[PDB]
């Protein structure tokens, strides 16, 4: 199922995900996809980011299923250093 994720650089990345994917795993895939761009020397480490869905801060260790995140939803990354 696709979701879309706005990165800290303001780029929007599309990603195939499953309900069983942990938020940690989605963050890592998004960062691999955008692949050190926007100054991405070594970018911001994904453990210093959080994924937000529909106004809610998602837990890194929980799964998309836990939040009833549907296909083609847009999520966003924020900085938590």
Describe the structure.
The protein is an alpha+beta fold. The protein has a single domain, classed as Roll (Ubiquitin-like (UB roll)). It contains one helix and five strands. A five-stranded mixed sheet has the order 2-1-5-3-4, covered by helices on one side. Strand 1 (2-6) and strand 2 (12-16) form a beta hairpin. The N and C termini lie far apart (30 Å). The record marks 62, 80 as: Interacts with activating enzyme. The modification (Microbial infection) ADP-ribosylthreonine is found at residue 74.
Strand order in the largest sheet: 2-1-5-3-4
Radius of gyration: 12 Å
Biggest pleated-sheet summary? 5 strands, mixed
Q: What is the beta-strand fraction?
A: 25-35%
In DSSP terms (H or I, runs of 4 or more residues), the helix count works out at 1
Modified residues ((Microbial infection) ADP-ribosylthreonine): 74
Site (Interacts with activating enzyme): 62, 80
Subcellular location: Cytoplasm; Nucleus
Organism: Homo sapiens
Short synopsis of the structure:
Residues 1-81 form the Ubiquitin-like domain. By secondary structure, the chain is of the alpha+beta class.
